[PDB]
Structure formats: C-alpha cells, structure tokens
mmCIF file of C-alpha atoms in Angstrom:
data_model
loop_
_atom_site.group_PDB
_atom_site.id
_atom_site.type_symbol
_atom_site.label_atom_id
_atom_site.label_comp_id
_atom_site.label_asym_id
_atom_site.label_seq_id
_atom_site.Cartn_x
_atom_site.Cartn_y
_atom_site.Cartn_z
ATOM 1 C CA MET Q 1399 242.217 -5.770 -92.229
ATOM 2 C CA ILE Q 1400 241.305 -8.923 -93.978
ATOM 3 C CA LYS Q 1401 237.870 -9.200 -94.960
ATOM 4 C CA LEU Q 1402 237.268 -12.790 -95.451
ATOM 5 C CA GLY Q 1403 233.786 -14.157 -96.633
ATOM 6 C CA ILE Q 1404 232.727 -17.634 -96.393
ATOM 7 C CA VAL Q 1405 230.075 -19.615 -98.694
ATOM 8 C CA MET Q 1406 228.299 -22.317 -96.749
ATOM 9 C CA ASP Q 1407 225.427 -24.361 -95.691
ATOM 10 C CA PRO Q 1408 223.089 -22.788 -92.783
ATOM 11 C CA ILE Q 1409 225.371 -22.066 -90.066
ATOM 12 C CA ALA Q 1410 222.028 -22.449 -88.017
ATOM 13 C CA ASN Q 1411 222.698 -26.153 -88.525
ATOM 14 C CA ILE Q 1412 226.398 -27.237 -87.956
ATOM 15 C CA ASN Q 1413 227.772 -29.186 -84.808
ATOM 16 C CA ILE Q 1414 230.622 -26.940 -83.458
ATOM 17 C CA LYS Q 1415 232.171 -29.880 -82.123
ATOM 18 C CA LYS Q 1416 233.082 -31.426 -85.341
ATOM 19 C CA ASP Q 1417 232.503 -28.569 -87.696
ATOM 20 C CA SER Q 1418 235.846 -27.729 -89.660
ATOM 21 C CA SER Q 1419 234.572 -24.590 -91.129
ATOM 22 C CA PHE Q 1420 233.668 -22.950 -87.879
ATOM 23 C CA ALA Q 1421 237.170 -24.089 -86.935
ATOM 24 C CA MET Q 1422 238.279 -21.567 -89.607
ATOM 25 C CA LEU Q 1423 236.100 -18.930 -88.502
ATOM 26 C CA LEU Q 1424 237.394 -19.219 -84.994
ATOM 27 C CA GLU Q 1425 241.007 -18.914 -86.358
ATOM 28 C CA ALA Q 1426 240.262 -15.751 -88.493
ATOM 29 C CA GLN Q 1427 238.489 -14.147 -85.904
ATOM 30 C CA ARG Q 1428 241.414 -14.698 -83.223
ATOM 31 C CA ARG Q 1429 243.608 -12.992 -85.989
ATOM 32 C CA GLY Q 1430 241.201 -10.116 -86.157
ATOM 33 C CA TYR Q 1431 239.784 -10.613 -89.587
ATOM 34 C CA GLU Q 1432 236.117 -9.130 -90.187
ATOM 35 C CA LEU Q 1433 234.040 -12.119 -91.296
ATOM 36 C CA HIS Q 1434 231.058 -12.174 -93.823
ATOM 37 C CA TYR Q 1435 228.824 -14.735 -93.893
ATOM 38 C CA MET Q 1436 227.068 -15.708 -97.046
ATOM 39 C CA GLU Q 1437 225.011 -18.696 -98.568
ATOM 40 C CA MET Q 1438 224.543 -19.910 -102.321
ATOM 41 C CA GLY Q 1439 221.249 -17.983 -102.333
ATOM 42 C CA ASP Q 1440 222.883 -14.670 -101.449
ATOM 43 C CA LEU Q 1441 225.496 -14.550 -104.320
ATOM 44 C CA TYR Q 1442 224.116 -12.608 -107.170
ATOM 45 C CA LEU Q 1443 225.412 -11.325 -110.628
ATOM 46 C CA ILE Q 1444 224.062 -8.033 -111.809
ATOM 47 C CA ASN Q 1445 225.468 -6.827 -115.330
ATOM 48 C CA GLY Q 1446 228.522 -9.114 -114.848
ATOM 49 C CA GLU Q 1447 229.191 -8.019 -111.445
ATOM 50 C CA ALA Q 1448 229.361 -10.761 -108.403
ATOM 51 C CA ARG Q 1449 227.689 -9.022 -105.448
ATOM 52 C CA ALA Q 1450 226.322 -10.378 -102.381
ATOM 53 C CA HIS Q 1451 223.950 -9.862 -99.595
ATOM 54 C CA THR Q 1452 226.159 -10.618 -96.366
ATOM 55 C CA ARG Q 1453 225.898 -10.454 -92.561
ATOM 56 C CA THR Q 1454 228.995 -9.666 -90.232
ATOM 57 C CA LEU Q 1455 229.787 -12.700 -88.297
ATOM 58 C CA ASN Q 1456 230.747 -13.301 -84.526
ATOM 59 C CA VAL Q 1457 231.446 -16.867 -83.588
ATOM 60 C CA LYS Q 1458 232.447 -18.139 -80.130
ATOM 61 C CA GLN Q 1459 232.488 -21.683 -78.792
ATOM 62 C CA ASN Q 1460 228.880 -21.701 -77.260
ATOM 63 C CA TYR Q 1461 226.750 -24.469 -77.470
ATOM 64 C CA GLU Q 1462 223.696 -22.241 -76.601
ATOM 65 C CA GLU Q 1463 224.850 -19.483 -79.110
ATOM 66 C CA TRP Q 1464 227.928 -19.875 -81.539
ATOM 67 C CA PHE Q 1465 227.166 -17.350 -84.046
ATOM 68 C CA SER Q 1466 225.460 -13.802 -84.150
ATOM 69 C CA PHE Q 1467 224.762 -11.242 -86.932
ATOM 70 C CA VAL Q 1468 226.204 -7.867 -86.027
ATOM 71 C CA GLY Q 1469 225.677 -5.991 -89.424
ATOM 72 C CA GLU Q 1470 224.344 -6.817 -92.931
ATOM 73 C CA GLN Q 1471 225.316 -5.560 -96.185
ATOM 74 C CA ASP Q 1472 224.925 -5.933 -99.889
ATOM 75 C CA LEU Q 1473 228.032 -5.454 -101.687
ATOM 76 C CA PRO Q 1474 230.673 -6.578 -104.346
ATOM 77 C CA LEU Q 1475 232.311 -9.551 -103.710
ATOM 78 C CA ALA Q 1476 235.284 -7.899 -104.773
ATOM 79 C CA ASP Q 1477 235.159 -5.849 -101.700
ATOM 80 C CA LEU Q 1478 236.105 -9.007 -99.700
ATOM 81 C CA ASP Q 1479 239.969 -9.889 -99.991
ATOM 82 C CA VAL Q 1480 239.186 -13.626 -99.450
ATOM 83 C CA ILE Q 1481 236.424 -15.903 -99.891
ATOM 84 C CA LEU Q 1482 236.222 -19.728 -98.634
ATOM 85 C CA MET Q 1483 233.755 -21.693 -100.570
ATOM 86 C CA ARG Q 1484 232.810 -24.300 -98.050
ATOM 87 C CA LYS Q 1485 229.436 -25.576 -99.778
ATOM 88 C CA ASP Q 1486 228.991 -29.254 -99.208
ATOM 89 C CA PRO Q 1487 228.558 -31.750 -102.294
ATOM 90 C CA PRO Q 1488 227.107 -32.631 -104.260
ATOM 91 C CA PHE Q 1489 228.496 -31.240 -107.229
ATOM 92 C CA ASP Q 1490 225.384 -30.007 -109.295
ATOM 93 C CA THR Q 1491 224.868 -27.445 -111.907
ATOM 94 C CA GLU Q 1492 223.966 -25.029 -108.976
ATOM 95 C CA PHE Q 1493 227.619 -25.480 -107.493
ATOM 96 C CA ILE Q 1494 229.053 -25.031 -111.199
ATOM 97 C CA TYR Q 1495 226.954 -21.782 -111.737
ATOM 98 C CA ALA Q 1496 228.015 -20.375 -108.259
ATOM 99 C CA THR Q 1497 231.910 -20.946 -109.355
ATOM 100 C CA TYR Q 1498 231.071 -18.452 -112.262
ATOM 101 C CA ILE Q 1499 230.009 -15.968 -109.660
ATOM 102 C CA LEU Q 1500 232.745 -16.449 -107.199
ATOM 103 C CA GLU Q 1501 235.053 -16.332 -110.387
ATOM 104 C CA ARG Q 1502 233.899 -12.668 -111.368
ATOM 105 C CA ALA Q 1503 235.096 -11.342 -107.993
ATOM 106 C CA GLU Q 1504 238.443 -13.155 -108.720
ATOM 107 C CA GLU Q 1505 238.902 -11.404 -111.688
ATOM 108 C CA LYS Q 1506 238.733 -8.321 -109.721
ATOM 109 C CA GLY Q 1507 241.096 -9.281 -107.060
ATOM 110 C CA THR Q 1508 239.392 -11.250 -104.613
ATOM 111 C CA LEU Q 1509 241.443 -14.745 -103.654
ATOM 112 C CA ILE Q 1510 238.841 -17.762 -103.785
ATOM 113 C CA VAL Q 1511 240.011 -20.688 -101.459
ATOM 114 C CA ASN Q 1512 239.729 -23.351 -103.709
ATOM 115 C CA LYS Q 1513 239.829 -21.672 -107.079
ATOM 116 C CA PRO Q 1514 236.679 -21.697 -109.158
ATOM 117 C CA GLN Q 1515 237.986 -22.730 -112.500
ATOM 118 C CA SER Q 1516 239.965 -25.792 -110.194
ATOM 119 C CA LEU Q 1517 236.627 -26.658 -108.722
ATOM 120 C CA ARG Q 1518 235.188 -27.294 -112.479
ATOM 121 C CA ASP Q 1519 238.393 -28.855 -113.472
ATOM 122 C CA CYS Q 1520 238.857 -31.252 -110.391
ATOM 123 C CA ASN Q 1521 236.027 -33.630 -110.089
ATOM 124 C CA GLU Q 1522 236.471 -35.212 -106.401
ATOM 125 C CA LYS Q 1523 235.945 -38.934 -108.121
ATOM 126 C CA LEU Q 1524 237.310 -38.122 -111.758
ATOM 127 C CA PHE Q 1525 240.317 -36.096 -110.797
ATOM 128 C CA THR Q 1526 241.956 -39.276 -109.897
ATOM 129 C CA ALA Q 1527 242.201 -40.264 -113.762
ATOM 130 C CA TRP Q 1528 245.261 -37.920 -113.836
ATOM 131 C CA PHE Q 1529 246.951 -39.902 -111.046
ATOM 132 C CA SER Q 1530 246.625 -43.493 -112.477
ATOM 133 C CA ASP Q 1531 249.645 -44.948 -111.207
ATOM 134 C CA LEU Q 1532 248.645 -44.012 -107.551
ATOM 135 C CA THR Q 1533 244.973 -45.397 -107.602
ATOM 136 C CA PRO Q 1534 243.334 -48.526 -107.896
ATOM 137 C CA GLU Q 1535 241.957 -50.396 -111.057
ATOM 138 C CA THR Q 1536 239.459 -47.806 -112.074
ATOM 139 C CA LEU Q 1537 236.542 -48.097 -114.716
ATOM 140 C CA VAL Q 1538 234.080 -45.258 -115.454
ATOM 141 C CA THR Q 1539 231.287 -46.247 -117.933
ATOM 142 C CA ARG Q 1540 227.687 -46.652 -118.635
ATOM 143 C CA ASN Q 1541 227.776 -50.298 -119.823
ATOM 144 C CA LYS Q 1542 226.618 -53.068 -117.826
ATOM 145 C CA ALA Q 1543 228.698 -55.361 -119.891
ATOM 146 C CA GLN Q 1544 231.757 -53.408 -119.009
ATOM 147 C CA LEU Q 1545 231.142 -53.400 -115.260
ATOM 148 C CA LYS Q 1546 230.535 -57.109 -115.279
ATOM 149 C CA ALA Q 1547 233.719 -57.977 -117.325
ATOM 150 C CA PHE Q 1548 235.577 -55.609 -114.753
ATOM 151 C CA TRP Q 1549 233.868 -58.036 -111.869
ATOM 152 C CA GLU Q 1550 234.842 -61.035 -113.946
ATOM 153 C CA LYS Q 1551 238.167 -59.656 -113.857
ATOM 154 C CA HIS Q 1552 238.542 -58.613 -110.418
ATOM 155 C CA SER Q 1553 235.998 -60.704 -108.427
ATOM 156 C CA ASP Q 1554 235.606 -58.322 -105.721
ATOM 157 C CA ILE Q 1555 235.057 -54.628 -106.581
ATOM 158 C CA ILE Q 1556 233.675 -51.420 -105.273
ATOM 159 C CA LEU Q 1557 230.685 -49.841 -107.058
ATOM 160 C CA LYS Q 1558 229.755 -46.169 -106.704
ATOM 161 C CA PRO Q 1559 227.653 -43.189 -108.142
ATOM 162 C CA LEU Q 1560 229.889 -40.139 -109.437
ATOM 163 C CA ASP Q 1561 227.422 -37.845 -107.528
ATOM 164 C CA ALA Q 1562 228.959 -42.725 -99.238
ATOM 165 C CA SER Q 1563 226.714 -45.340 -101.171
ATOM 166 C CA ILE Q 1564 229.277 -48.023 -102.155
ATOM 167 C CA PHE Q 1565 228.118 -51.201 -103.268
ATOM 168 C CA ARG Q 1566 230.708 -54.241 -102.377
ATOM 169 C CA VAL Q 1567 230.316 -56.694 -105.434
ATOM 170 C CA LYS Q 1568 232.025 -59.829 -104.306
ATOM 171 C CA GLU Q 1569 231.936 -63.664 -105.793
ATOM 172 C CA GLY Q 1570 228.519 -64.989 -105.250
ATOM 173 C CA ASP Q 1571 227.101 -61.494 -105.434
ATOM 174 C CA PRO Q 1572 223.642 -61.978 -106.980
ATOM 175 C CA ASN Q 1573 222.929 -58.434 -107.792
ATOM 176 C CA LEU Q 1574 225.446 -56.632 -110.011
ATOM 177 C CA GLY Q 1575 222.451 -56.319 -112.726
ATOM 178 C CA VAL Q 1576 220.417 -54.520 -110.650
ATOM 179 C CA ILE Q 1577 223.290 -52.500 -109.113
ATOM 180 C CA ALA Q 1578 224.728 -51.506 -112.702
ATOM 181 C CA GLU Q 1579 221.099 -50.898 -113.664
ATOM 182 C CA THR Q 1580 220.472 -48.975 -110.432
ATOM 183 C CA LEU Q 1581 223.886 -46.900 -110.597
ATOM 184 C CA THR Q 1582 223.757 -45.896 -114.327
ATOM 185 C CA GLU Q 1583 220.054 -45.547 -114.514
ATOM 186 C CA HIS Q 1584 219.468 -48.135 -117.282
ATOM 187 C CA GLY Q 1585 222.526 -47.094 -118.816
ATOM 188 C CA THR Q 1586 222.096 -43.158 -119.022
ATOM 189 C CA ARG Q 1587 224.372 -42.184 -116.126
ATOM 190 C CA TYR Q 1588 228.017 -42.851 -115.741
ATOM 191 C CA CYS Q 1589 229.295 -44.746 -112.512
ATOM 192 C CA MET Q 1590 232.641 -45.664 -111.336
ATOM 193 C CA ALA Q 1591 233.734 -49.452 -110.388
ATOM 194 C CA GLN Q 1592 237.099 -50.214 -108.722
ATOM 195 C CA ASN Q 1593 238.987 -53.329 -107.357
ATOM 196 C CA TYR Q 1594 238.620 -53.792 -103.576
ATOM 197 C CA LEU Q 1595 241.365 -53.097 -101.333
ATOM 198 C CA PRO Q 1596 240.960 -55.236 -98.051
ATOM 199 C CA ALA Q 1597 243.548 -52.677 -96.688
ATOM 200 C CA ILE Q 1598 240.492 -50.494 -95.695
ATOM 201 C CA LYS Q 1599 240.510 -52.843 -92.769
ATOM 202 C CA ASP Q 1600 243.283 -51.359 -91.507
ATOM 203 C CA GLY Q 1601 241.371 -48.071 -91.913
ATOM 204 C CA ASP Q 1602 240.325 -45.358 -94.446
ATOM 205 C CA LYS Q 1603 242.842 -42.503 -93.947
ATOM 206 C CA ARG Q 1604 242.147 -38.882 -94.449
ATOM 207 C CA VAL Q 1605 245.210 -36.729 -95.174
ATOM 208 C CA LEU Q 1606 245.000 -32.917 -95.567
ATOM 209 C CA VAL Q 1607 247.295 -30.802 -97.759
ATOM 210 C CA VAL Q 1608 247.656 -26.814 -97.397
ATOM 211 C CA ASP Q 1609 249.094 -25.338 -100.321
ATOM 212 C CA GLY Q 1610 250.805 -28.492 -101.619
ATOM 213 C CA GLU Q 1611 252.159 -29.408 -98.164
ATOM 214 C CA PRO Q 1612 250.772 -32.599 -96.407
ATOM 215 C CA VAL Q 1613 249.758 -31.946 -92.819
ATOM 216 C CA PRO Q 1614 252.196 -34.569 -91.018
ATOM 217 C CA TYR Q 1615 249.199 -35.992 -88.972
ATOM 218 C CA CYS Q 1616 246.113 -37.872 -90.671
ATOM 219 C CA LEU Q 1617 242.923 -39.519 -89.549
ATOM 220 C CA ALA Q 1618 242.200 -43.099 -90.069
ATOM 221 C CA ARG Q 1619 238.564 -44.231 -90.255
ATOM 222 C CA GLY Q 1620 238.938 -48.136 -89.561
ATOM 223 C CA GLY Q 1621 236.072 -48.526 -86.850
ATOM 224 C CA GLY Q 1622 236.423 -45.335 -85.268
ATOM 225 C CA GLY Q 1623 238.494 -42.088 -85.534
ATOM 226 C CA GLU Q 1624 242.281 -42.470 -84.910
ATOM 227 C CA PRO Q 1625 244.682 -39.733 -86.087
ATOM 228 C CA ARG Q 1626 248.254 -40.734 -86.517
ATOM 229 C CA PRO Q 1627 251.700 -39.617 -88.177
ATOM 230 C CA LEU Q 1628 251.882 -39.908 -91.930
ATOM 231 C CA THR Q 1629 253.062 -43.322 -92.842
ATOM 232 C CA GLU Q 1630 256.037 -43.436 -95.302
ATOM 233 C CA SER Q 1631 253.731 -44.153 -98.122
ATOM 234 C CA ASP Q 1632 251.613 -40.888 -97.018
ATOM 235 C CA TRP Q 1633 254.240 -38.622 -97.567
ATOM 236 C CA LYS Q 1634 254.939 -40.202 -100.986
ATOM 237 C CA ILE Q 1635 251.582 -39.902 -102.144
ATOM 238 C CA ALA Q 1636 250.831 -36.318 -100.977
ATOM 239 C CA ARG Q 1637 254.329 -35.365 -102.017
ATOM 240 C CA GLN Q 1638 253.410 -36.448 -105.514
ATOM 241 C CA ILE Q 1639 249.887 -34.678 -105.841
ATOM 242 C CA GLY Q 1640 250.907 -31.649 -103.640
ATOM 243 C CA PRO Q 1641 252.674 -29.609 -106.619
ATOM 244 C CA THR Q 1642 249.456 -29.991 -108.778
ATOM 245 C CA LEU Q 1643 247.434 -29.017 -105.878
ATOM 246 C CA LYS Q 1644 249.377 -25.715 -105.366
ATOM 247 C CA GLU Q 1645 249.428 -24.773 -108.972
ATOM 248 C CA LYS Q 1646 245.749 -25.267 -109.533
ATOM 249 C CA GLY Q 1647 245.108 -22.956 -106.805
ATOM 250 C CA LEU Q 1648 243.510 -26.036 -104.630
ATOM 251 C CA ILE Q 1649 244.899 -24.392 -101.373
ATOM 252 C CA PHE Q 1650 242.888 -26.902 -99.110
ATOM 253 C CA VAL Q 1651 242.566 -30.234 -99.841
ATOM 254 C CA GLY Q 1652 241.524 -33.801 -98.326
ATOM 255 C CA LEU Q 1653 243.118 -37.194 -99.856
ATOM 256 C CA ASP Q 1654 241.099 -40.276 -99.241
ATOM 257 C CA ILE Q 1655 243.959 -42.803 -98.846
ATOM 258 C CA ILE Q 1656 242.880 -46.475 -98.406
ATOM 259 C CA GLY Q 1657 246.302 -48.333 -97.845
ATOM 260 C CA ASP Q 1658 248.766 -47.109 -100.145
ATOM 261 C CA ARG Q 1659 246.346 -46.344 -103.000
ATOM 262 C CA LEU Q 1660 244.632 -42.707 -103.532
ATOM 263 C CA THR Q 1661 241.016 -43.112 -103.844
ATOM 264 C CA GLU Q 1662 239.642 -39.403 -104.032
ATOM 265 C CA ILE Q 1663 240.470 -35.929 -103.473
ATOM 266 C CA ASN Q 1664 238.301 -33.748 -101.425
ATOM 267 C CA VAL Q 1665 238.515 -30.298 -103.094
ATOM 268 C CA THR Q 1666 234.898 -28.745 -101.996
ATOM 269 C CA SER Q 1667 234.675 -28.944 -98.065
ATOM 270 C CA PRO Q 1668 237.478 -31.310 -96.520
ATOM 271 C CA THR Q 1669 236.918 -31.591 -92.889
ATOM 272 C CA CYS Q 1670 238.567 -33.864 -90.220
ATOM 273 C CA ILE Q 1671 240.529 -30.775 -88.699
ATOM 274 C CA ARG Q 1672 239.337 -31.000 -85.214
ATOM 275 C CA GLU Q 1673 240.078 -34.535 -84.874
ATOM 276 C CA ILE Q 1674 243.831 -34.306 -85.619
ATOM 277 C CA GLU Q 1675 244.002 -31.287 -83.558
ATOM 278 C CA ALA Q 1676 242.921 -32.590 -80.215
ATOM 279 C CA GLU Q 1677 245.513 -35.026 -80.326
ATOM 280 C CA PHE Q 1678 248.729 -33.217 -81.831
ATOM 281 C CA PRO Q 1679 250.599 -30.067 -81.474
ATOM 282 C CA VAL Q 1680 249.123 -29.023 -84.952
ATOM 283 C CA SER Q 1681 247.130 -25.972 -85.912
ATOM 284 C CA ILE Q 1682 245.791 -26.676 -89.240
ATOM 285 C CA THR Q 1683 243.570 -23.555 -89.315
ATOM 286 C CA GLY Q 1684 246.832 -21.529 -88.539
ATOM 287 C CA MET Q 1685 248.422 -22.988 -91.492
ATOM 288 C CA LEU Q 1686 245.549 -22.538 -94.054
ATOM 289 C CA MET Q 1687 245.349 -18.828 -92.615
ATOM 290 C CA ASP Q 1688 248.910 -18.534 -93.033
ATOM 291 C CA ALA Q 1689 248.628 -19.896 -96.595
ATOM 292 C CA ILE Q 1690 245.969 -17.114 -97.195
ATOM 293 C CA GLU Q 1691 247.769 -14.312 -95.785
ATOM 294 C CA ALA Q 1692 250.889 -15.088 -98.013
ATOM 295 C CA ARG Q 1693 248.912 -15.698 -101.257
ATOM 296 C CA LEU Q 1694 247.077 -12.534 -100.561
ATOM 297 C CA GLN Q 1695 250.542 -10.700 -100.619
ATOM 298 C CA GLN Q 1696 252.000 -12.424 -103.866
ATOM 299 C CA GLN Q 1697 249.058 -13.213 -105.870
#
C-alpha cells in the first residue's frame, strides 16, 4: 500500500495527549499504511543515494505503550512513497543538511511533506518578508543603533532571536542596550524587532492550512487554549498565503496570527491538531492524508 516514513524527535519522549505527529501516525495506520520510523541520525547518503535505517512502527492509544517496533531494515528512502519531515526546530545546519538527503529521495520519486527546497527557502520568521502588507512593522538587523531607532519610532516593540524568547521593550525600559547586545551577540548575529500588538491580549491564534486550504477552526492562545471558527480576517490572511503554500509544496503549515496581523509561518513541525479536533467535527489528520494520497497520484 502506501509506505509512509516519518523523521522525528524520539518517539520514546512524546506526550500522546498533545502530540500532533502521533495523531498523523494514528490516522495513516487506521488507513492501512505501513509505517517506517526514522531519526535525523538514521538518514545517510552513500554515493548520492539517500538511504536510512528504519523500524516498522505500530502505534496505539496506550499511555503504558504507545509504540512498538515490528521490523527494522536499512533501505533506499526512494522505497517510501511519502516521508513526513516532523523534526522540531531550531533550523540549524543539521536540519539544512538533512533536507539535502530527503531531497535525493524526492528526486527518485518520494513525496516530502514539506518539500525540502521549500524548507530552505521559507524561514519560519523571514518568510514573512514576502507578506509585507499582512505583518507588523518588522526590522531584521545586527545594529543596536537601528533597534533603538525602531524603538524610538514605536515606543513599545517585540525583540526576538531568529533561531519563545521574546523581549517586550516598552517606554521606560532600561535595557534595550543589553538586549540588542544579547540578541545580536555584540552585533554579530541578526535579530528581529517588531512593533507590539496589544491584540495578543485577545489571544495568539494558530491557524492550520492543508495544501493551501485553511482548516475552518483555529486555536487561540490567550491565557489558555480556546479553539474557534476562523474570523472574517482569518480567511482573508490564510486565503492570501494559501496559494503560495500549495505551489511551494508546503503541504502542512501553521500560521501565527496575532489579531489581524500574520506574525509567523510554521513550516517545520506545526501542531495544535488535537486541540481543535476535540471540540469540532473536523479531522485535520484526515485532510492531510487526503492531500497526500491525491498528491501521490498527480505529482
């Protein structure tokens, strides 16, 4: 049938209660796919060939034993029909080099759920530089003198590292200096600066997109988790980003919407699946897998 691999962080350590990857696995299993489990380190490249040491995976909703290995083989990634890259950030050289490996398989027919080139191209933070009109005032620099001006120009702003650890730098803030100095490491690393949107008060909204189609229910993070229907402005945004997602082969994405402003695009390991699923008649995992099987046919 379909032989789907997954590349992820130790299954031994996920929490099956909130883990979105695991939600996928349950769904593919239910559909009668054969599952192959890999880790960064199982990925190898021998003379131009992507190969891996996989384990055959059986997952089950069981807190005492959610997974089990039922086989193990070394093979060509090109044997798998689809591989889900579900590695948690940060985006390091290690992730980038892995995308080169996943990409050799792809050239030999495997489908990579998020396309490898696409993962290099779309920084989680910097992709938003291509969606100017939908995001907040954003500055990306190494110069303290620029952060400071930005701050003078906006009074209240968000400071963050490109690779949460967000600094809210308000009027009266005695520390911009040290922050700049800290985040850019004495001006040798780039850092992002952004004006603050008090709208996060109303919650930090996480919206999912499956092959360009926004899931109609989102997750707000404004004190606790609270799913809800997409606002008229959620459609609007997702609606505008969507086409680019589909064509860049970014088949499963998370959007971080703060108010009516797009703050970030999660292309690596977007989550929040189980949260919405509990509360609404929606199978996000089923959409995804629907999207996979169909891509699988076209190509």
